[PDB]
Amino acid sequence: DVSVHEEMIADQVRTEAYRLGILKNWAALRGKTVLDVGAGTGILSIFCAQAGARRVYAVEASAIWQQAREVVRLNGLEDRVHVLPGPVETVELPERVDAIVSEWMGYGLLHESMLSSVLHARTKWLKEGGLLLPASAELFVAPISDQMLEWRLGFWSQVKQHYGVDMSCMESFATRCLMGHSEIVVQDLSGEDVLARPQRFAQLELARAGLEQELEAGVGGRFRCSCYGSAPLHGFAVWFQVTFPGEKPLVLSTSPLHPATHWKQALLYLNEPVPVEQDTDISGEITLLPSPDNPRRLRILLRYKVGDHEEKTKDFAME
Amino acid sequence: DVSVHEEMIADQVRTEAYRLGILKNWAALRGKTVLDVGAGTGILSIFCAQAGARRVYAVEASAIWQQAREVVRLNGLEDRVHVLPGPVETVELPERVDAIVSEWMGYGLLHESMLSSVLHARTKWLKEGGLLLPASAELFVAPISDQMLEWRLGFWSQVKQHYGVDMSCMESFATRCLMGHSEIVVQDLSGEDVLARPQRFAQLELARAGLEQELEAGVGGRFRCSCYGSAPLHGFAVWFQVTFPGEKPLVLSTSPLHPATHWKQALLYLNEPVPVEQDTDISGEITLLPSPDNPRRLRILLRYKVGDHEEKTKDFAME
Ligand SMILES: COCn1cc(C[N@@H+](CC[C@H](N)C(=O)O)CC[C@H]2O[C@@H](n3cnc4c(N)ncnc43)[C@H](O)[C@@H]2O)c(N)nc1=O
Numbered sequence: 006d007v008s009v010h011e012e013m014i015a016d017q018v019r020t021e022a023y024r025l026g027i028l029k030n031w032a033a034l035r036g037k038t039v040l041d042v043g044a045g046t047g048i049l050s051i052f053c054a055q056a057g058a059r060r061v062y063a064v065e066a067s068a069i070w071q072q073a074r075e076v077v078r079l080n081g082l083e084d085r086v087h088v089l090p091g092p093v094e095t096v097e098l099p100e101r102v103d104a105i106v107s108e109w110m111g112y113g114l115l116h117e118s119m120l121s122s123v124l125h126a127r128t129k130w131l132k133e134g135g136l137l138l139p140a141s142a143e144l145f146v147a148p149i150s151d152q153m154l155e156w157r158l159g160f161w162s163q164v165k166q167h168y169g170v171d172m173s174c175m176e177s178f179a180t181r182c183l184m185g186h187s188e189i190v191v192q193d194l195s196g197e198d199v200l201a202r203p204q205r206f207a208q209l210e211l212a213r214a215g216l217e218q219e220l221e222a223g224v225g226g227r228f229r230c231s232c233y234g235s236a237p238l239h240g241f242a243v244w245f246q247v248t249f250p251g252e253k254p255l256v257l258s259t260s261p262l263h264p265a266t267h268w269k270q271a272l273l274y275l276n277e278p279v280p281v282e283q284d285t286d287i288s289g290e291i292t293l294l295p296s297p298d299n300p301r302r303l304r305i306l307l308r309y310k311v312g313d314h315e316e317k318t319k320d321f322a323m324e
Numbered sequence: 325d326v327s328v329h330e331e332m333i334a335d336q337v338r339t340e341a342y343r344l345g346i347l348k349n350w351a352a353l354r355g356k357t358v359l360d361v362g363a364g365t366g367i368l369s370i371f372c373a374q375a376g377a378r379r380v381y382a383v384e385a386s387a388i389w390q391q392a393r394e395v396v397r398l399n400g401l402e403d404r405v406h407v408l409p410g411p412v413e414t415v416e417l418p419e420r421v422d423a424i425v426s427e428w429m430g431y432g433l434l435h436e437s438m439l440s441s442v443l444h445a446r447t448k449w450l451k452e453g454g455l456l457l458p459a460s461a462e463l464f465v466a467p468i469s470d471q472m473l474e475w476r477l478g479f480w481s482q483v484k485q486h487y488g489v490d491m492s493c494m495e496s497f498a499t500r501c502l503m504g505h506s507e508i509v510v511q512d513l514s515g516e517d518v519l520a521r522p523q524r525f526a527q528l529e530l531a532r533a534g535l536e537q538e539l540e541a542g543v544g545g546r547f548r549c550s551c552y553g554s555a556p557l558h559g560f561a562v563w564f565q566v567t568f569p570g571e572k573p574l575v576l577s578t579s580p581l582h583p584a585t586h587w588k589q590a591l592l593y594l595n596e597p598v599p600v601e602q603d604t605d606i607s608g609e610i611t612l613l614p615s616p617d618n619p620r621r622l623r624i625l626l627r628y629k630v631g632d633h634e635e636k637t638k639d640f641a642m643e
């Protein structure tokens with residue numbers, strides 16, 4: 006429970022990006038009304054009030070809504086920030102709003118399926134031409150040679166050199182266990198793990214017509230790239246950024262090339278490592294989907310072709 | 325599954341202590357027979373063969389026994405290390421053995437209740453006067469001021485100074501969530517978290533008559549100590565060491581004052597922090613017990629008295 010809220014507030018990239026993304030829109034928020042969808046402990050609703058909003062409706066479905074209300078009171082804002090429990094789909098606000106703010110992104114952007122609630126609130130409560138913060142999201146994929154995974158798998162074949170016992174057979178076992186499943190793995194990588202230039206495979210203008218239907222059918226696209234050097238290819242990492250409109254937009258990124266965040270990246274491991282070399286061509290397609298039992302659980306459909314190998318498919322679901 | 329075996333082999337304290345604890349007993353093992361209870365991937369059975377044992381029976385109940393057999397084969401030892409699947413309580417060995425080795429310790433020493441299987445194998449299969457490795461275990465307790473916990477709880481009251489929003493109310497919420505439960509928390513501490521001299525509260529000679537019954541009734545004892553300085557007392561940490569007989573015995577320790585191991589320590593948090601000062605007297609009693617539904621789940625009964633406060637009790641069970 007509180008672990009996730011701890012990780013959020015200790016996430017300076019997330020917190021400062023929202024703080025400044027909101028403050029950057031002071032001109033659009035001053036004297037206006039805001040709806041914070043999934044307000045959690047309330048910090049984004051306070052940010053909006055501090056950016057000058059005249060009234061903020063902080064809607065939160067989880068039990069932690071009570072803490073938001075106390076946060077509001079401690080900051081002297083009970084007169085203009087109103088905390089409302091329950092789902093935004095049935096909350097009753099006294100008025101439509103000039104802006105929506107929300108921290109709706111999950112692991113792999115869409116795990117938890119929360120973007121649909123923001124879109125429902127936009128259709129229901131946002132005035133015509135109103136503001137959404139963030140306004141867009143972009144999805145990226147890169148092939149990876151996960152250095153930590155390479156070490157963990159390879160260490161079994163190093164036991165002879167550290168303890169005098171050959172355990173190299175455990176490398177294959179570990180490979181089957183760690184790579185031969187179909188779960189999305191959430192882990193943080195660094196630039197050292199990125200094996201080719203990251204590719205943007207989709208862009209979501211959050212206000213765009215039809216996005217609700219696109220989320221049900223699958224969001225994604227094709228990609229192509231060329232490997233930087235000789236390495237074991239372990240699979241692909243997927244991450245996102247979101248953009249707050251401005252006049253140079255502020256981007257909150259979850260790329261392994263950028264400061265770590267609590268979203269980490271979503272890793273899609275092949276069943277076993279594939280050796281590649283400099284300039285090995287990799288192409289494929291990535292689709293993010295709801296799981297059929299539960300649209301809130303992220304599913305990722307991967308098609309990929311490595312060099313001259315045949316195209317393969319692997320269908321992943323969130324761990 | 326494989327995560328735990330990875331953490332074991334990457335644990336140089338654990339692995340090197342067993343390696344040298346076994347090699348230290350070359351005189352007792354050479355040309356003799358060994359039973360490795362819960363042999364897992366087999367490294368301890370190989371160590372014994374390398375210490376000169378003529379035959380080693382590696383008994384492993386989990387599915388990973390097949391990897392032990394392949395490890396044995398890769399090291400050319402299939403003629404004298406025999407991997408036997410299933411529980412040691414019903415394995416059939418062709419002979420009684422001169423020694424038992426086992427890595428039976430769990431979190432908080434006794435979580436998983438495996439020591440009972442080693443004791444069953446001792447009674448059933450160990451020759452009279454035979455060797456047990458390790459031969460003894462000692463249990464320690466210290467009051468702690470968990471610096472990481474102090475930071476995590478206190479950070480909510482620091483949000484005003486980092487983001488301009490008072491969130492100090494979340495400190496109390498977080499305290500209730502992180503401390504006001506009755507779960508044993510497994511976490512690694514360091515010497516900076518230790519608030520008084522650690523106290524040995526029990527010693528287990530593993531070969532001693534009656535230990536099986538003592539494990540069912542509870543293992544533990546009283547302790548008393550005096551605080552080093554002014555700090556918030558968060559509770560107590562429990563850890564262990566085991567000793568391999570020799571001629572100066574080798575000790576494998578899980579103390580926070582010693583190099584980290586995969587056992588970490590077992591933390592027993594009070595419902596809320598208690599301020600203490602230099603020389604505040606703390607006394608109490610710690611009992612490790614089986615959980616009533618499931619003797620394999622560790623239960624810890626804590627009685628404690630801090631300074632002039634009344635004695636309190638808190639009954640914990642493994643997370
Ligand atoms: C890996 O990051 C994912 N992640 C994120 C959060 C953070 N949470 C608070 C953010 C808030 N800016 C803050 O400052 O606390 C966002 C989701 C929150 O929105 C709530 N929510 C969802 N659907 C709703 C609906 N239809 N109507 C109303 N509220 C709805 C949900 O209850 C949760 O509290 C979480 N808590 N867990 C997670 O795993």
Ligand SMILES: COCn1cc(C[N@@H+](CC[C@H](N)C(=O)O)CC[C@H]2O[C@@H](n3cnc4c(N)ncnc43)[C@H](O)[C@@H]2O)c(N)nc1=O
Nearest residue numbers: 362363364365367383384385386410411412427430431441
């Ligand atoms: C926090 O550390 C706890 N920890 C430890 C282990 C390590 N494991 C292998 C150690 C082995 N030296 C090696 O080198 O792999 C020990 C327990 C192993 O003993 C097996 N076992 C238990 N009761 C048995 C019975 N009555 N007869 C036969 N085998 C029995 C059990 O199947 C397990 O494999 C684990 N695997 N998980 C855990 O959490």
